[PDB]
Amino acid sequence: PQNTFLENIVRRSSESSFLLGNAQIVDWPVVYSNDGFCKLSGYHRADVMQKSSTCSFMYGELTDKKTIEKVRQTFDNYESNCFEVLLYKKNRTPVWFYMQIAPIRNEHEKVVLFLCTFKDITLFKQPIEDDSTKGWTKFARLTRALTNSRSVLQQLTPMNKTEVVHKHSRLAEVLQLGSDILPQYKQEAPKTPPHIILHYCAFKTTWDWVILILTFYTAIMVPYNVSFKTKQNNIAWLVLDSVVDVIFLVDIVLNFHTTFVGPGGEVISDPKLIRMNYLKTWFVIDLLSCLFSSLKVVRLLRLGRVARKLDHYLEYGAAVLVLLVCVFGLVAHWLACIWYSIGDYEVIDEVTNTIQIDSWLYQLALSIGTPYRYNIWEGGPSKDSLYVSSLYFTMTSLTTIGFGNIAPTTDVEKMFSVAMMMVGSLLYATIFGNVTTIFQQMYANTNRYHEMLNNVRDFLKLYQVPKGLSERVMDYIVSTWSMSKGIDTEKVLSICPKDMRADICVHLNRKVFNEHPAFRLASDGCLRALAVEFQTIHCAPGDLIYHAGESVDALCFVVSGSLEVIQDDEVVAILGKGDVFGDIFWKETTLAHACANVRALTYCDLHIIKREALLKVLDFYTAFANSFSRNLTLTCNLRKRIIFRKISDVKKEEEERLRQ
Amino acid sequence: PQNTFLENIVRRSSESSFLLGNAQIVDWPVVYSNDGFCKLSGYHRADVMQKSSTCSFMYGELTDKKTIEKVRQTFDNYESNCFEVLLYKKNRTPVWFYMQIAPIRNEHEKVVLFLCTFKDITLFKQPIEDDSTKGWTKFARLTRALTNSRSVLQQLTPMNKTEVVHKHSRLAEVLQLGSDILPQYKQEAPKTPPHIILHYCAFKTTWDWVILILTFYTAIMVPYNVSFKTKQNNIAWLVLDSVVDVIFLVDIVLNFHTTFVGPGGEVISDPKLIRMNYLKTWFVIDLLSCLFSSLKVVRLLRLGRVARKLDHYLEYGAAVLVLLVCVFGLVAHWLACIWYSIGDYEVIDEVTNTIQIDSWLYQLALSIGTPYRYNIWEGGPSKDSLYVSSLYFTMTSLTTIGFGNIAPTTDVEKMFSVAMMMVGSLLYATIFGNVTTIFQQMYANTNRYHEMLNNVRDFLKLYQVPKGLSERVMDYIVSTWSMSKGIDTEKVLSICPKDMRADICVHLNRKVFNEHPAFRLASDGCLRALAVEFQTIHCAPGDLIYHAGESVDALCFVVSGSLEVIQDDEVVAILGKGDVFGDIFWKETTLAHACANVRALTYCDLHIIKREALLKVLDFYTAFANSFSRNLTLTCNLRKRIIFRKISDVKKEEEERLRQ
Ligand SMILES: [K+]
Ligand SMILES: [K+]
Ligand SMILES: [K+]
């Protein structure tokens, strides 16, 4: 919902007369005399500063030939004019107009709320008032006493060695208007400049997960290529690397054409702000990562890219667990690469020509079976075996299992082992604490329900409650949790605003408003004033709703279940669905008591509205009380005692009368 | 804020007359006739015991030549006098004065609140009242009927074989006054005696972290030097050891000149208390640690020093994690030193001359490659390899990984291993439980926000709320958490005092007081009486604030957003920023209803003040109500219906009138 005349005009616009009009009986809204009419050009609000689309009441002079129907007619023409009518101004002069015209129709197809951006002048023609005629008071001071459209572009004398150039905001401003103004009626939603995409569309979503997948691929492939020195025979990987690099470069380019949330939580949409913000925030790192061994470790920063985007991901529970297991695998892989690099460095001393029998590649070669042979040193474990052994060792070390068939024995490997031990201990602790908490986050609610059940059971056992009452209490608790699964309405309604709470309650009833032929002629005033008062109740079988222990003070509505109005051990009516039972409240102003013993056959759901909160609303909306009185029929009028009389035992009464 | 005359005079001062005065119209404050004028020397409060800087009203005698303007003039002289005026005393005699004078001016430069420490006498000259003239009643009993400055130093007869020595509190007490009295006006803050430093300055902070760093250094270096027997060739370490020792000794000396918080939570500042407290509390341990193998284990007590200072550190989250990892490293290092000591003890039996093939140094030597050789037993693993192996083993044992390439096999090592196992299990459990809790302490708040979101989402899903209402509720919750991130104002305002709460609220408004030209002529009374009543509201787009469902009873102020006052499907005014809309309350004393349908264009923030809590304050401060009435202009007076009339359809009404 937007009338498209205020939201984004306080930044770029200038002096204008954004006439709206409403077009039923006489004048309504001219509204925006914005950007310069503060307290120095016209009236203030409640005047033609804010209404009377065709302006008046600021006249202050006589009705001359030009001062009647020239632009006063133009205001409701909407199309085009160039004449000169009078509208009073601070200059104390017979004001006439130089202006520009611009139409636009509607979205609702009503020929209302046009654009009509106007300028108005007083100076450029003539002052001829004799209020001050002391030489240069109105014949040369005219260039001083105007505070109008002149003060937008050309705030100097109208001559100023210039004839038509200074006519750009009074005579030739129509080229700066039209499509440069917001529309006359549209729909309010986050809108973007041309060739700009929002950050929550179906395009940026797919690219976010695509970039995440490619980053997860690079974080795996780059350390492997750096440590386990590979080859280039397969040109397939050589071209997929270029494909991924160019995809990331295209994403860097496309990041200029997106939207980001700023201070306060609103979608910012303007090319210059987007560009400079993205630049200053991430362009250095993005360029460094996009474009010899150290170059790949620099290239790894696309993982920090996903780290910055992490706020978009997560918060969904299962995704957190998947991310945690993925990062555990990633750190295991990185430690495997470092471990293999160390193991390859240690074997084969280059000072002499000998193989160091300590390392871990020599022990692995001895255990597997394939040894190192000299012919300069070639022949040993295959690359797949080396990688799988490195991963297996680092997984033994991270998971704190520890086997010992692959263990550090040299000097460098022990230092690296203690470093890995500290790092892995920290990561293990944090990661699996988070995993356990995430897994317990829902069994927390389940255990809340179980704790409620256990507390009720313990209370029933401790005080030695009989079997029937205990089983009824258990059944009621089970049913109430079944239809109210953990969710509590009071808090959710408390954290919402007043109007939104009223709307939520109105939709919560949904079966006593559009189902009962009484609440029909109420659009949005009575429905949102009564629903805040209706309260839903659930009643167990055998419960006495309005037995002879309470007075009738609530117009109860039945929406699900069945009730029988027991009167002296027997039933006079059996209420079903959509049958209101209760006392008349709006036309007696009295009180009575329970004329019956209303029970509940099955589990029932009723909608109580209190008496004092019922007739007040219909008294406020007097047009609704008439329909309410004329369209409500009480199925069981629990106000008057009925003449209740039972079939087949006055027979023996008459028999005894004839006998006695 | 301190007038410097009560805070610290009840411990050292004596009889005095600490005259203040206030100097505008007539008398005000002489105030402190402290330390002896309880109920036995003069009047009580509300008299020249507390006001009338120039004293009077305690006369009780006739106006003699000396009894008019001698010291009664001295009180406002402030400079010097030695004369004798009358001021009535319990002696029932024509009192005259022996006194001492002392001036001091101000801090605010006003020549007010001088020092004027006076003494007053009655005895030393003469009693000549004939009330009791029964011999030794006023000529010899004079030495009994005085209860004044005599009762401070020389409480005996004025003769007492002494002439001028007994004149030390009536004639020669000026040398015990002056700079020995607190000032006349200063600023209140924790102050220290000369050559005393506070415990939260920028000096003791740097020394606290310096001592912490040096203690962390010693706790690492001392066990290493004790176990791995080092040398002295590098004189560099030999001089850094002396430098650190002398630094710690200087710190022990400097601890005499610091301040410590005592009982109740106040900064104690007095050399004797500081000295004796520090001595009795820590001097034994500090001296023992400051100043052959056992001497270093004693020297290790500087770690207990940091343990005592620990309260200063910690409580910052990240510092807790850093401290925990540091102590884990420290215990690993200590266990490494003990393990190497055991391993060095076991190898090479001294009864025979043989090497024990069990230990762990022999197995390590066999695995590494360098064996033990005999020529008495020399040659083996280097010192760096020995230390790194010891650390690696103890880190395998503490982190509960366990590899087995270095494992206990002798008799002593198994007992030490089980002891280390129990100790490491305890330390592991406590340390990493604390680490996990500290890490979860902030994701607790994040998970509270996520739980609120999940509860709202579940409530919306369960009851099948339509799309528009659900999305509006989600947006409102997101915005409210965005600008109110976890922080709840009610609790923080509850735990604060009343005046501080009022000040916090006054600063919380900050945009309806110093921005609106109405709340200008109110210094501190009306602002702190109205801000406790103002409540801020946030309204979502499309919300109806004061539609035709409520009566106008609140002078709402707009500080951010925009509102349009819809009247019969169309708008008569569009409120902006700093535009108050509401009913007049202080000059009609009536009630009306919503003459409009005020909506909210964008997200808005308003400042409601209730009617009954508004005019009461301005009624209390009658000088403020005049300015409030004369300086408030309602932008949208939602009290009176305006004559609203719409432009361009009476045209067809007149057309039909001419047609029908
Ligand atoms: K093992
Ligand atoms: K283990
Ligand atoms: K083993």
Short mmCIF file of C-alpha atoms in Angstrom, two decimals, chain B residues 8-262:
data_model
loop_
_atom_site.label_atom_id
_atom_site.label_comp_id
_atom_site.label_asym_id
_atom_site.label_seq_id
_atom_site.Cartn_x
_atom_site.Cartn_y
_atom_site.Cartn_z
CA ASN B 8 36.86 12.45 57.27
CA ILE B 9 36.74 14.72 60.33
CA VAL B 10 35.02 12.34 62.77
CA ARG B 11 38.27 10.45 63.39
CA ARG B 12 41.02 13.01 64.10
CA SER B 13 39.33 16.34 64.82
CA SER B 14 38.55 17.93 68.18
CA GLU B 15 36.43 20.81 69.51
CA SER B 16 35.84 23.35 66.76
CA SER B 17 33.39 25.84 65.24
CA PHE B 18 33.57 25.11 61.51
CA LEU B 19 31.66 28.21 60.34
CA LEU B 20 30.44 28.10 56.72
CA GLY B 21 28.04 30.97 56.01
CA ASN B 22 26.22 31.49 52.69
CA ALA B 23 26.25 35.28 52.21
CA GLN B 24 23.04 36.48 50.46
CA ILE B 25 20.41 37.75 52.96
CA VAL B 26 21.28 37.95 56.74
CA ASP B 27 22.76 34.85 58.52
CA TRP B 28 22.69 31.13 57.21
CA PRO B 29 24.99 28.30 58.54
CA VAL B 30 27.67 28.36 61.11
CA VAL B 31 27.09 24.56 61.12
CA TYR B 32 29.78 22.49 62.79
CA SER B 33 30.23 23.11 66.48
CA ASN B 34 31.64 19.60 66.48
CA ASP B 35 33.30 17.39 69.10
CA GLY B 36 32.08 18.60 72.46
CA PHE B 37 29.00 20.79 71.96
CA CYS B 38 26.60 17.83 72.18
CA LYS B 39 24.21 19.06 74.88
CA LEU B 40 26.59 20.83 77.28
CA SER B 41 28.09 23.92 75.62
CA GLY B 42 25.46 25.67 73.49
CA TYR B 43 22.11 25.34 71.72
CA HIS B 44 20.93 22.52 69.43
CA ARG B 45 20.08 22.33 65.72
CA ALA B 46 17.96 25.10 64.13
CA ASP B 47 19.94 27.59 66.26
CA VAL B 48 23.44 29.12 66.23
CA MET B 49 24.37 25.50 66.77
CA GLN B 50 23.62 25.14 63.05
CA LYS B 51 23.04 28.57 61.42
CA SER B 52 23.68 32.29 61.96
CA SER B 53 27.34 32.32 60.92
CA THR B 54 27.58 35.40 63.11
CA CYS B 55 26.17 33.88 66.29
CA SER B 56 23.46 35.36 68.50
CA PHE B 57 20.27 34.45 70.42
CA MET B 58 22.37 32.77 73.11
CA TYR B 59 22.98 35.88 75.20
CA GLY B 60 21.28 35.42 78.58
CA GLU B 61 22.89 38.57 79.98
CA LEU B 62 23.07 42.34 79.44
CA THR B 63 24.69 44.28 76.59
CA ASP B 64 27.98 45.36 78.13
CA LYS B 65 30.76 47.25 76.36
CA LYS B 66 32.59 44.03 75.44
CA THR B 67 29.40 42.10 74.68
CA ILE B 68 28.40 43.67 71.34
CA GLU B 69 30.81 43.59 68.36
CA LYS B 70 34.05 41.83 69.34
CA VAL B 71 33.81 38.23 68.09
CA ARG B 72 30.29 38.64 66.77
CA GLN B 73 32.20 40.86 64.34
CA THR B 74 34.97 38.25 64.07
CA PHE B 75 32.68 35.59 62.60
CA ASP B 76 32.17 37.49 59.34
CA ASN B 77 35.67 39.03 59.36
CA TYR B 78 37.20 35.58 58.57
CA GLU B 79 40.72 37.01 59.00
CA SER B 80 41.94 37.69 62.56
CA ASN B 81 40.78 39.04 65.94
CA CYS B 82 41.50 38.46 69.61
CA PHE B 83 38.69 40.36 71.38
CA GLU B 84 35.94 39.08 73.70
CA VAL B 85 32.19 39.18 72.97
CA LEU B 86 29.34 37.48 74.85
CA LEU B 87 27.69 34.18 73.94
CA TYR B 88 25.65 32.46 76.63
CA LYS B 89 26.93 29.23 78.18
CA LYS B 90 25.90 26.79 80.94
CA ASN B 91 28.12 28.67 83.42
CA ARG B 92 25.43 31.39 83.77
CA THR B 93 28.19 34.02 83.50
CA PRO B 94 29.18 36.96 81.26
CA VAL B 95 31.03 34.77 78.78
CA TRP B 96 33.93 36.21 76.77
CA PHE B 97 36.23 34.50 74.27
CA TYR B 98 39.72 33.14 73.79
CA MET B 99 39.92 31.86 70.24
CA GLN B 100 41.94 31.09 67.12
CA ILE B 101 41.20 32.25 63.56
CA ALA B 102 41.74 30.62 60.16
CA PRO B 103 40.55 31.65 56.65
CA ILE B 104 40.08 29.80 53.36
CA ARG B 105 38.13 31.06 50.41
CA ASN B 106 36.40 28.72 47.87
CA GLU B 107 36.74 26.67 44.73
CA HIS B 108 33.79 28.33 42.94
CA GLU B 109 35.28 31.81 43.56
CA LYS B 110 32.44 33.21 45.67
CA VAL B 111 34.07 34.14 49.04
CA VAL B 112 31.67 31.76 50.83
CA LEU B 113 32.02 28.74 53.15
CA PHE B 114 35.18 29.76 54.97
CA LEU B 115 36.97 27.62 57.58
CA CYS B 116 36.79 29.77 60.73
CA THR B 117 37.73 27.10 63.28
CA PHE B 118 36.95 28.66 66.68
CA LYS B 119 37.25 27.49 70.28
CA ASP B 120 35.37 29.75 72.78
CA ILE B 121 35.95 29.93 76.56
CA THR B 122 34.03 30.94 79.66
CA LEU B 123 36.37 30.15 82.55
CA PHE B 124 39.82 31.59 82.22
CA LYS B 125 39.02 35.28 82.82
CA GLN B 126 36.30 35.82 85.45
CA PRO B 127 32.82 34.87 86.63
CA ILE B 128 31.11 37.94 88.15
CA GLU B 129 27.46 36.86 88.28
CA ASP B 130 25.83 37.18 91.70
CA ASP B 131 23.47 34.23 91.18
CA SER B 132 25.64 32.11 93.49
CA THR B 133 28.00 34.10 95.73
CA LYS B 134 28.41 31.69 98.65
CA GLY B 135 32.17 32.02 98.89
CA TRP B 136 33.72 29.48 96.52
CA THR B 137 30.82 29.39 94.06
CA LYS B 138 32.00 31.59 91.18
CA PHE B 139 35.47 32.73 92.32
CA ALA B 140 36.92 29.25 92.97
CA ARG B 141 34.25 26.96 91.46
CA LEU B 142 34.96 28.58 88.07
CA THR B 143 37.36 25.66 87.45
CA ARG B 144 34.38 23.27 87.70
CA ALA B 145 31.54 24.95 85.80
CA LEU B 146 33.28 25.13 82.40
CA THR B 147 32.54 22.43 79.81
CA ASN B 148 34.25 23.85 76.72
CA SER B 149 37.60 23.85 74.89
CA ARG B 150 39.21 23.31 78.31
CA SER B 151 38.00 19.70 78.02
CA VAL B 152 40.18 18.97 74.96
CA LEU B 153 43.83 19.27 76.06
CA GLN B 154 44.09 20.85 79.55
CA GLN B 155 40.98 19.94 81.57
CA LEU B 156 42.48 21.19 84.85
CA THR B 157 42.58 24.51 86.69
CA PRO B 158 43.99 27.42 84.63
CA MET B 159 46.82 27.94 87.15
CA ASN B 160 47.98 24.31 87.58
CA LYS B 161 51.59 25.53 88.07
CA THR B 162 51.47 26.48 84.38
CA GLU B 163 51.07 29.76 82.50
CA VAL B 164 51.46 29.33 78.73
CA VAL B 165 51.70 25.55 78.19
CA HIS B 166 48.01 25.12 79.07
CA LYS B 167 47.30 27.72 76.34
CA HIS B 168 47.49 25.24 73.47
CA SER B 169 43.80 24.82 72.57
CA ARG B 170 42.49 28.34 73.33
CA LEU B 171 45.43 30.60 72.48
CA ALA B 172 47.98 28.50 70.57
CA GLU B 173 45.86 25.98 68.65
CA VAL B 174 46.25 27.89 65.37
CA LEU B 175 49.42 25.87 64.75
CA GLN B 176 47.26 22.72 64.93
CA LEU B 177 44.80 24.15 62.37
CA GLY B 178 44.79 25.62 58.87
CA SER B 179 46.16 22.99 56.50
CA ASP B 180 45.18 20.34 59.08
CA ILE B 181 41.49 20.90 58.25
CA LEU B 182 39.63 19.71 55.17
CA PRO B 183 39.20 22.31 52.38
CA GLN B 184 36.22 24.63 51.94
CA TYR B 185 35.05 23.28 48.56
CA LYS B 186 36.45 20.49 46.36
CA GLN B 187 35.34 17.55 44.21
CA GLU B 188 34.42 14.16 45.65
CA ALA B 189 36.45 11.19 44.41
CA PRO B 190 38.64 8.43 45.88
CA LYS B 191 41.64 10.33 47.23
CA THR B 192 44.94 9.00 48.55
CA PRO B 193 47.61 10.18 51.01
CA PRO B 194 50.90 11.49 49.58
CA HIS B 195 53.07 8.88 47.85
CA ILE B 196 50.15 6.42 47.66
CA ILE B 197 48.82 4.95 44.41
CA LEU B 198 45.38 3.51 43.71
CA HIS B 199 44.88 -0.11 42.66
CA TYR B 200 43.08 0.76 39.39
CA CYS B 201 45.47 3.32 37.88
CA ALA B 202 47.40 2.93 34.62
CA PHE B 203 50.55 2.00 36.60
CA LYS B 204 49.34 -0.91 38.74
CA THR B 205 47.54 -2.31 35.68
CA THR B 206 50.77 -2.48 33.68
CA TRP B 207 52.61 -3.95 36.67
CA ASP B 208 49.85 -6.53 37.18
CA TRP B 209 50.18 -7.86 33.64
CA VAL B 210 53.99 -7.56 33.82
CA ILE B 211 54.06 -9.65 37.01
CA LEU B 212 51.65 -12.12 35.39
CA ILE B 213 53.94 -12.50 32.37
CA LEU B 214 57.03 -12.95 34.54
CA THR B 215 55.25 -15.49 36.75
CA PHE B 216 54.19 -17.44 33.66
CA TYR B 217 57.84 -17.36 32.58
CA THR B 218 59.16 -18.64 35.92
CA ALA B 219 56.55 -21.40 36.18
CA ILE B 220 57.88 -22.68 32.85
CA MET B 221 61.61 -22.16 33.39
CA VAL B 222 62.10 -23.31 36.99
CA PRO B 223 60.91 -26.96 36.68
CA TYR B 224 62.84 -27.30 33.41
CA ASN B 225 66.05 -26.12 35.09
CA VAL B 226 65.44 -28.41 38.08
CA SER B 227 64.74 -31.57 36.07
CA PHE B 228 66.67 -31.12 32.80
CA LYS B 229 69.93 -30.13 34.50
CA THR B 230 71.17 -27.11 32.53
CA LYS B 231 74.41 -25.12 32.54
CA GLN B 232 75.63 -21.56 33.11
CA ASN B 233 77.72 -20.75 29.99
CA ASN B 234 75.05 -18.38 28.70
CA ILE B 235 75.33 -15.52 31.21
CA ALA B 236 72.29 -14.02 29.49
CA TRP B 237 69.89 -16.30 31.36
CA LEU B 238 71.95 -15.78 34.52
CA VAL B 239 71.33 -12.03 34.35
CA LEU B 240 67.67 -12.23 33.27
CA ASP B 241 67.07 -14.43 36.32
CA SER B 242 68.51 -11.70 38.55
CA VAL B 243 66.53 -9.03 36.68
CA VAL B 244 63.27 -10.90 37.24
CA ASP B 245 64.11 -11.56 40.89
CA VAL B 246 64.89 -7.90 41.55
CA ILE B 247 61.72 -6.86 39.70
CA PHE B 248 59.67 -9.12 41.97
CA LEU B 249 61.46 -7.74 45.04
CA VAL B 250 60.71 -4.17 43.89
CA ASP B 251 57.08 -5.20 43.45
CA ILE B 252 57.02 -6.59 47.00
CA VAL B 253 58.40 -3.27 48.26
CA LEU B 254 55.91 -1.27 46.16
CA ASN B 255 53.00 -3.28 47.58
CA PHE B 256 53.39 -1.19 50.76
CA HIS B 257 52.32 1.88 48.76
CA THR B 258 49.05 0.66 47.23
CA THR B 259 45.36 0.67 48.16
CA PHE B 260 43.10 -2.33 48.75
CA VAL B 261 39.34 -2.67 49.04
CA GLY B 262 38.20 -3.61 52.52
#
